[PDB]
Amino acid sequence: RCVVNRNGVLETTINHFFSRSGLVGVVNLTDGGTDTTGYATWDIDIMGFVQLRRKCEMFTYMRFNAEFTFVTTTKNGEARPYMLQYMYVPPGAPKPTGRDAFQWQTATNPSVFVKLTDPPAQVSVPFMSPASAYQWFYDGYPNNMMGTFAVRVVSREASQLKLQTRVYMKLKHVRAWVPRPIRSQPYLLKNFPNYDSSKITNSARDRSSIKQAN
Amino acid sequence: TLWYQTNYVVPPETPGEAYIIAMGAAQDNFTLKICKDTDEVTQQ
Amino acid sequence: TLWYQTNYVVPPETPGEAYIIAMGAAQDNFTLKICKDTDEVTQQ
Amino acid sequence: ANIVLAYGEWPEYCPATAVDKPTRPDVSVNRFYTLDSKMWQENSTGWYWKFPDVLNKTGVFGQNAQFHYLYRSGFCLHVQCNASKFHQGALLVAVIPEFVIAGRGSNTKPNEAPHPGFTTTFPGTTGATFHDPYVLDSGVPLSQALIYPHQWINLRTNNCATVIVPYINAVPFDSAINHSNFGLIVIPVSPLKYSSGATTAIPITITIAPLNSEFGGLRQ
Amino acid sequence: ANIVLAYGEWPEYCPATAVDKPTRPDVSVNRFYTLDSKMWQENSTGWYWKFPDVLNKTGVFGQNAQFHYLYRSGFCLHVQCNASKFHQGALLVAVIPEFVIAGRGSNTKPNEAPHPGFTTTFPGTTGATFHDPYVLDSGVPLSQALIYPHQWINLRTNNCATVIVPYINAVPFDSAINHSNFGLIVIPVSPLKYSSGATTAIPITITIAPLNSEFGGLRQ
């Protein structure tokens, strides 16, 4: 066709640019026998996947609330009605060390008790930074930002299933400051913007001549 | 297109080789619709 | 003191050797007291 | 002269809940600290400076910034590049908040990958040259580095640039030694050219004025 | 900038007794048609252009001037000649109404004497060079060619000239193909000089604005 009309001005705001329920982490649970693993923790970092990391390294400062949705499946896929405990560990509180340790019975670690046959779990985490905004680019010399996230199967004895949880993160109420360019070189590490000195990828694919329209 | 109207005239003691930087941006008329993920990233 | 901040850059067909003339004078605050003869003169 | 104001805001004082009032010198720190001239040549790559540790060894500002604990100030940058009328080229001058120098390597292991040293992250009063100016030594292309406050120093139009930059940080007070706030970058996008017999190198001079400085927590 | 108005009159519309009203585009013909640059050198002689057949092959004006029958327009000429500050020389730019190119020869018989060809009388969009610039290729000396609307392009004072010329004809409408109305002449009165190592040729750029155009008698 030929789009002569003007488009919409609501899909370009920062709040719309970030607010959408996206997949952010995948946690594997085993709940074994001899090898007493039992639990499976997952530190909160939005830089996990390379799809939101490229969108959040576009800005220097950000400020947002988060909504976490927990979708737990089994190995084959069937959902038997077992009780599950999700636990949010605030920044500074110690991580749980065992399946039946005393960090699970601690009252100041907010837990969610939900079954496999239930709708998936959904919690909201507020702005929990000591500064006024988050910042991924810290130029200088000085651990943890948002909190740890554990999960176990509530039972007296030990179950014989292995689970597989998906932590879907949605952002809300996001504000940004000091935009910066979009990174073209591929990633090498998780917490560092290291590129490769050899094999610098050009940000524009090649053509034959400068006097053409390829 | 960018054409060579007259010629690059130059006095002595001056290099006859220069460059042109081309820049580009949008306007107040520029508007976007239907958000979607990019494909510059290859890894996942 | 007089230091070399950046560098003496120069285009072609131009000497890269110049000079600085330094001058100096007093102000309205400058005042003198107790007159006396000078000693630039050697003979009498 | 054209003055570019960084993000449209002027550097102003702090309106914090500290009973110990932060001091204000106003006399011996609001003077034009002039750095040494950089010798820009044909095969040059660029230069970058980290500001709150550029002037930590120089005079009253360095003494009052090393022996204090809390720091907040804006800056007035002024860059001359005086060349003849027969030289040609172009410079891009731009400030970048939280300019993190990346490491160059091809290693994915955590404590095996290379990292920049202390003389690369914090150059000091003599600056440091880029290794790959196409990616700003950060994996980010310089073609879209015009999103920052910036000017062009074109050797056929002018010879000067000036940038009034306020205090950009998430916390209104910060240590002036353990955290470089923002960096200055000059890059020869168009190289230097000259006929034979001219001056083979152009000097670049930078002067800095610490506008609206505030210090706190005096200690030994 | 100094604007020379040809004979003190501005180009205006026709106040004719034709019931078919002549059309006025006003949109796609009042744009800056930029010709190619001419490479002026030391041994150059000059250039001349015939205007109502310079722009008969170029775009909307050429299409609306070839497929019509009656034509009337003024012109805004603008000539840049950008050289360095080390070159020297002078150009004379002047418009001449009814500039008839003469033939060069020594024959007095009617159908034996030489006559200029079609590519000499009507050069087109690429112009033509003089053979004898001292007599304007018309037997008329150029020393007194200052009787025409003219400017000097002196390479130590300016680099531009502009001439707003109205419609000069005995009949208010004329065919734009079979009659060239007036010509533009640039002549290097003082030759070009430069030291070794400079650019050996200076470009000359011409832009034309067809002010107040009128077309009549549209046909295939």
* Segments of chain A assigned E as strands: 22-28, 59-73, 83-89, 111-115, 121-125, 134-135, 148-153, 164-179
D100, D138 contact by CB (below 8 A) = yes
Integer Cα distance of A18 and A170 in angstroms? 8
Residues 6+ apart with CB under 8 A from D140: A180, A181, A182, A183, A184, A185, A193
Integer Cα distance of E36 and A163 in angstroms? 75
Domain with A81 in it: 1-214
Mutate to test the interface with A, among D140, D171, D173 (most CBs of A within 10 A): D140
Integer Cα distance of A201 and A74 in angstroms? 41
A43, A149 contact by CB (below 8 A) = yes
CB contact (8 A) between residue D86 and residue B21: no
Residues 6+ apart with CB under 8 A from A71: A120, A165, A166, A168
Mutate to test the interface with D, among B8, B10, B19, B20 (most CBs of D within 10 A): B19
* Segments of chain E assigned E as strands: 4-5, 33-34, 38-40, 47-50, 70-72, 75-80, 88-97, 128-129, 150-154, 160-165, 182-193, 202-209, 214-216
Q: Domains of chain E: which residue ranges?
A: 1-220
- For residue E114 the two structure tokens come to 């030489």
A71, A165 contact by CB (below 8 A) = yes
Give the phi and the psi of residue E120 in degrees, each rounded to 5. -100, -40
Distances (CA, A) of D91 to D188, E153, E173: 5, 33, 56
D202, C9 contact by CB (below 8 A) = yes
Residue entry with tokens 């597989």: A164
* Burial (CB count within 10 angstroms: exposed 0-12, middle 13-18, buried 19+), residue D2: exposed
Rg of chain B over all Cα atoms, to the nearest angstrom: 21
Say whether residue D156 is in contact with chain E using an 8 A CB cutoff. Answer: no
Q: Chain D residue with minimal CA distance to B21?
A: D190
Count CB pairs under 8 A between chains A and B.
Answer: 30
Distances (CA, A) of E24 to A52, E58, E74, E75, E212: 58, 18, 13, 15, 8
Rg of chain E over all Cα atoms, to the nearest angstrom: 19
Q: Tell me which method was used to determine the 3D structure.
A: cryo-EM
Integer Cα distance of B6 and E82 in angstroms? 9
Q: How many CA atoms lie within 13 A of D56 on its CB side?
A: 21
E203, E34 contact by CB (below 8 A) = no
Rg of chain D over all Cα atoms, to the nearest angstrom: 19
Which residues in chain B have Cβ-Cβ distances shorter than 8 Å to D189?
Answer: 21
Distances (CA, A) of D163 to A88, A183, D53: 46, 25, 18
CB-nearest partner of E85 from D85, D195, D196: D85
- For residue D170 the two structure tokens come to 């998430």
Cα end-to-end distance, chain E, whole Å: 43
Q: How long a stretch of residues is chain A?
A: 214
Integer Cα distance of A184 and A201 in angstroms? 8
Per DSSP, the three-state class of E40 is strand
Distances (CA, A) of E169 to A67, C40, D126, E166, E172: 82, 89, 73, 10, 7
Which residues in chain E have Cβ-Cβ distances shorter than 8 Å to D196?
Answer: 197
D182 DSSP β-pair partners: D97
Buried b (16+ CB within 10 A) or exposed e, D23-61: eeeeeebeeebbbbbbebeeebebbbbbbbbbbbeeeeb
The one-letter amino acid code at E197 reads G
Give the phi and the psi of residue D215 in degrees, each rounded to 5. -125, 150
Cα end-to-end distance, chain A, whole Å: 23
Phi-psi group of A141: left, alpha or beta (phi > 0 → left; psi -120 to 50 → alpha; rest → beta): beta
D96, D148 contact by CB (below 8 A) = yes
Which residues in chain A have Cβ-Cβ distances shorter than 8 Å to B40?
Answer: 54, 184
Residue entry with tokens 């109404």: E97
Please tell me which chains touch E, using 3 or more CB pairs under 8 Å as the contact test.
B, C, D
E139, E28 contact by CB (below 8 A) = no
Rg of chain C over all Cα atoms, to the nearest angstrom: 21
Q: How many CA atoms lie within 13 A of D26 on its CB side?
A: 4
Q: Chain D residue with minimal CA distance to A192?
A: D102
Q: What is the 3-state secondary structure (H, E, C) of D87-150?
A: CEEEEEEEEEECCCCCCECCCCCCCCCCCCCHHHHCCCCCCEECCCHHHCCCCCCHHHHHHCCE
Q: At CA A148, angle to CA A147 and CA A151, rounded to 5?
A: 140
E83, B14 contact by CB (below 8 A) = no
Residue D170: count other Cβ atoms within 10 Å of its Cβ.
17
CB contact (8 A) between residue D88 and residue B13: no
* Burial (CB count within 10 angstroms: exposed 0-12, middle 13-18, buried 19+), residue D204: buried
Longest alpha-carbon distance in chain E: 65
Q: What is the 3-state secondary structure (H, E, C) of chain C?
A: CCCCCCCCCCCCCCCCCCCCCCCCCCCCCCCCCCCCCCCCCCCC
* Among candidate residues D68, D42, D39, D41, the one with its CA nearest the CA of residue D56: D68
Say whether residue A202 is in contact with chain B using an 8 A CB cutoff. Answer: no
CB-nearest partner of B21 from D190, D193, D197: D190
Q: At CA A208, angle to CA A207 and CA A211, rounded to 5?
A: 100
Please tell me which chains touch A, using 3 or more CB pairs under 8 Å as the contact test.
B, D
Please tell me which chains touch C, using 3 or more CB pairs under 8 Å as the contact test.
B, D, E
**Resolution of the coordinates, Å:** 3.4
Mutate to test the interface with A, among B1, B31, B38 (most CBs of A within 10 A): B31
The total number of structural domains in chain A stands at 1
Give the phi and the psi of residue D141 in degrees, each rounded to 5. -70, 145
Q: Chain A residue with minimal CA distance to D98?
A: A139
Integer Cα distance of A96 and A85 in angstroms? 13
Integer Cα distance of A105 and A17 in angstroms? 39
Integer Cα distance of D57 and E15 in angstroms? 81
Integer Cα distance of E35 and D16 in angstroms? 66
